Amino acid sequence: PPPLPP
Amino acid sequence: SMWTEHKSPDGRTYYYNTETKQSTWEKP
């Protein structure tokens, strides 16, 4: 799964 | 181009660019 943006 | 649609756990709609491999908020 892709990481969430800040 | 080349994006992924996912729902931020906090309760938001975020997208991940698989063309450059980065995370972004809101539709680009």
Curated annotation (Swiss-Prot), chain B:
Give all residue intervals belonging to the WW domain.
Answer: 1-28
Q: Which residues carry this modification: Phosphoserine?
A: 8
Q: In which tissues is it expressed?
A: Expressed in the brain cortex (at protein level). Widely expressed.
The record's subcellular locations are:
Nucleus speckle; Nucleus matrix
**Subunit arrangement?**
Interacts with the N-terminus of HTT. Interacts with the phosphorylated C-terminal domain of POLR2A. Interacts with AKAP8L, SF1, SRPK1, ENAH, ATBF1 and MECP2. Interacts through the WW domains with formin proline-rich regions and with WASL/N-WASP.
Q: What does this protein do?
A: Binds to WASL/N-WASP and suppresses its translocation from the nucleus to the cytoplasm, thereby inhibiting its cytoplasmic function. Plays a role in the regulation of cell morphology and cytoskeletal organization. Required in the control of cell shape and migration. May play a role in cytokinesis. May be involved in pre-mRNA splicing.
Q: What is known of its domains?
A: The WW domains are essential for localization to nuclear speckles.
Task: Indicate the family of this protein.
Answer: Belongs to the PRPF40 family.
What name does this protein carry? Pre-mRNA-processing factor 40 homolog A
The root-end lineage is:
Eukaryota, Metazoa, Chordata, Craniata, Vertebrata
Whole sequence portion shown: 144 to 171 of 957
